[PDB]
């Protein structure tokens, strides 16, 4: 039984049916494979670590935990307070296994201040005047331990006596927390391998799993990662995840004795034949992704030979994207389109990825996708999957079902993901283009466009000053070059503050108070300066945008105004660490990409909010029928009608403030904001949505504008 110690990565899925899947889902592909592994990693230990995390240094914690055997056979047996505890040895006389005198017991019953005497001389009694390691040392003995406090570490903690003594001495939730430990044990089995979150002495039969990704920052033991890694490194004990799939373990890639050419290795062949009629007809919060190594090549030489080329690593591209596009390993696909741009699917892979680096080293690169580079790449081949794991998506980058705004530098390929991707399916409702907000919308709203006005003001300056500014921006070494650039910045700032802010502030409901809005902006400042209650995510894409916009020639400005605007926005943007935009894209579109893999049809839902007919008529509306009108705020999808109905009885504590004008422009607002995590993870939401009457034929004439408040209630539909 070789043991592999595991430290979870950045977004390790925890509520998964099997911890094993979040490690690398390829291990579940074959029965012949999954039968070779045990897991352990019990929940009770997890909870203990969650508590002690705030009270021990990494070195101490590692030193304490490292000695614990794999299946913890011991228990911590909490004792009740002496007045309570003493009665137990007489309620059952044979339970007085230490045979404490009856006189002392009833002397304790008589005393106003019952002493620790009942605890005194009891073997392996742990007083509150004890330390964490004291418990751990006894844990290695396997026998149960008697303690006088709940804050203990290393073994499941359960009551020694019936609850009657601890009641009053402890409170409900405290009395509740020990229940699984009161009947804790479960068996551990002797398979070939056993994974574990519990650390251990690294040695000839213990290995550290290396996934090549950042740890879970929230996971309490991530602080141990450096010390563990270096110790493994100095003794060559790291294991790349692929090594686990081989019949015999070895740290290495491309071994002699194995070609590593088997269906098990090919992560692209994601298959789901088995079923259990479980409520998760699908868990749309769990998303399988892969890290892949891809080889890029340019045109061959005059004699058909080709250069060695370069291979890069793409991180955490969702696998269903590739599978649905029938991408296969070992196939040299064409990279460039007719017009020289990238083929769409490659762009999607880049956009939804987290990062792109050179394969060998750990240097991240922003890829160019234009005619800039000489000997440009024309062919691409995916070679192998460095890792393939499922990841939790629920509410990770964005928090509210209402709306979210993503900031990207000018020249990004947002158009591709918002148009080509849904168009590539165009059969299942993904979003409504009327709900997505292009970052350029407000700039286009002014009667002379914001760009035209900026150009018109700008030309008043001397051309040489403008020329000097543009050159300085392009030339990286031109530090500051204050005169030229600052003058332009002043004009930009003055104009934007003057015109853009009031215009932006005049579109408040359009950004947030629709069904569900996805919005783009060139900088967070564009929203903060206008006080728009929408979460803003500072994204970034792993492609060079500057060169990209240098290829777009059909614009108001001759490619020079564009770079000027780009610099201005970047200067305007607040200094902060930006996140990969792919994560947000994964949160939005990811679940939808798994739809075609499903076996059974979907079921629609919604949470319509009522509307009394009185106010409508009072507002001059002509409406048939007495029953209150209702309006669909947001539609959802499930597939197990049973559990879906079972989950529909919850009453959301979020009111809706519906507002609609005479022009039927309808708006919604949730007084308590609706958070995404509140949505059960079996659901599925569209990227964007537009509120609308459930039955437009009920109304016969729109009176004046209307506002009202109502509750929210998930309901079926037909």
């Amino acid at each position: 039984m070789i043991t592999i110690v595991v430290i979870p990565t950045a977004h390790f899925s925890w509520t998964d049916t099997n911890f094993l899947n979040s490690v690398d889902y390829r291990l579940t592909s074959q029965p012949k494979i999954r039968d070779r592994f045990a897991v352990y990693a019990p929940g009770w230990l997890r909870r203990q670590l969650d508590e002690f995390s705030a009270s021990l240094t990494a070195s101490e914690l590692l030193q304490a935990l490292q000695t614990i055997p794999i299946p913890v056979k011991a228990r911590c047996l909490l004792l009740p307070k002496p007045k309570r505890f003493a009665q137990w040895l007489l309620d059952v006389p044979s339970a007085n296994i230490w045979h404490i005198p009856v006189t002392t017991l009833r002397a304790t019953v008589a005393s106003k201040h019952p002493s620790s005497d009942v605890y005194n001389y009891i073997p392996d009694h742990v007083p509150p005047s004890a330390e964490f390691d004291t418990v751990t040392r006894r844990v290695a003995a396997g026998r149960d331990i008697y303690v006088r406090s709940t804050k203990v570490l290393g073994a499941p903690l359960c009551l020694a006596a019936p609850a009657k003594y601890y009641a009053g001495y402890l409170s409900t939730h405290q009395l509740d927390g020990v229940y699984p430990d009161n009947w804790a044990p479960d068996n551990f089995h002797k398979r070939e391998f056993c994974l574990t979150i519990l650390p251990s002495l690294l040695g000839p039969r213990t290995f550290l799993l290396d996934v090549d990704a950042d740890r879970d920052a929230s996971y309490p033991l991530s602080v141990l990662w450096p010390q563990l890694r270096v110790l493994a490194l100095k003794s060559r004990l790291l294991l790349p995840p692929v090594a686990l799939l081989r019949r015999v373990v070895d740290p290495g890639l491309k071994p002699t004795w194995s070609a590593d050419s088997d269906a098990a290795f090919r992560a692209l062949r994601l298959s789901r034949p088995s079923s259990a009629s479980k409520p998760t007809g699908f868990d749309f919060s769990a998303l399988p992704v892969v890290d892949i190594i891809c080889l890029f090549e340019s045109e061959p030489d005059d004699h058909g030979r080709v250069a060695p080329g370069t291979r890069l690593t793409i991180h955490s591209v969702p696998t269903d994207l590739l599978t649905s596009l029938s991408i296969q390993e070992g196939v040299r696909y064409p990279l460039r389109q007719e017009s020289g741009m990238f083929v769409p699917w490659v762009l999607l892979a880049l956009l939804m990825s987290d990062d792109v680096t050179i394969s060998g080293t750990r240097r991240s690169v922003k890829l160019e996708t234009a005619h800039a580079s000489a000997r440009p790449f024309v062919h691409i081949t995916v070679e192998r999957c460095a890792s393939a794991r499922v990841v939790d998506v629920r509410g990770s980058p964005a928090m509210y079902a209402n709306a979210v705004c993503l900031t990207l530098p000018k020249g990004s390929y947002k158009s591709t993901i918002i148009d080509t991707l849904p168009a590539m399916f165009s059969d299942l409702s993904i979003l409504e283009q009327a709900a997505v907000i292009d970052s350029d919308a407000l700039g286009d709203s002014l009667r002379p466009s914001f760009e035209t006005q900026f150009l018109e003001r700008l030309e008043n300056l001397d051309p040489k000053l403008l020329d000097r500014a543009v050159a300085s921006i392009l030339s990286p070494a031109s530090d500051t070059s204050d005169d030229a650039v600052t003058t332009v910045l002043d004009v930009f700032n003055a104009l934007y503050r003057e015109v853009m802010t009031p215009a932006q502030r005049s579109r408040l409901p359009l950004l947030t108070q629709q069904g569900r809005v996805l919005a783009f902006a060139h900088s967070d400042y564009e929203l903060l300066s206008a006080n728009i209650p929408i979460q803003v995510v500072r994204g970034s894409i792993p492609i060079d945008h500057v060169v990209n916009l240098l290829a777009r020639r059909n614009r108001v400005g001759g490619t020079a105004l564009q770079v000027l605007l780009d610099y201005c926005y970047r200067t305007q943007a607040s200094p902060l660490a930006p996140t990969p935009a792919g994560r947000l894209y994964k949160q939005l579109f990811g679940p939808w990409l798994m739809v075609p893999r499903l076996s059974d049809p979907l079921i629609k839902l919604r949470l319509v909010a009522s509307a009394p007919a009185k106010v409508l008529r009072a507002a001059g509306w002509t409406i048939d029928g007495d029953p209150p009108l209702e309006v669909s705020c947001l539609c959802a999808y499930v597939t197990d009608r049973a559990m879906a109905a079972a989950l529909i009885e919850r009453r959301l504590d979020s009111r809706a403030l519906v507002n609609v004008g005479g022009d039927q422009l309808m708006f919604v607002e949730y007084a308590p904001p609706l958070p995404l995590v509140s949505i059960p993870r079996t659901f599925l939401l569209p990227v964007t949505y537009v509120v609308h009457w459930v039955s437009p034929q009920r109304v016969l004439l729109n009176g004046g504008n209307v506002s009202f408040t109502s509750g929210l209630e998930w309901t079926f539909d037909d």
């Binding site: 010390q227 002699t256 004699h303 058909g304």
Partner: protein, 50 residues
């Protein structure tokens, strides 16, 4: 250039990657096929053997 980096105590606690072992061929030069041989099928048959 000008990447002024401050000394950090934890940063130096990694250790270099000394143990790198190769089981392949200890070579660094490759023989190549710079100009392929022609496939004759009508005349000059037999002058080449693949």
């Amino acid at each position: 250039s000008k990447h002024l980096s401050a000394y950090l105590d934890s940063a130096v606690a990694n250790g270099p990657e000394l143990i790198v072992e190769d089981t392949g061929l200890c070579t660094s030069f490759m023989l190549l096929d710079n100009i392929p041989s022609a496939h004759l099928t009508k005349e000059l048959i037999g002058f080449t053997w693949f």
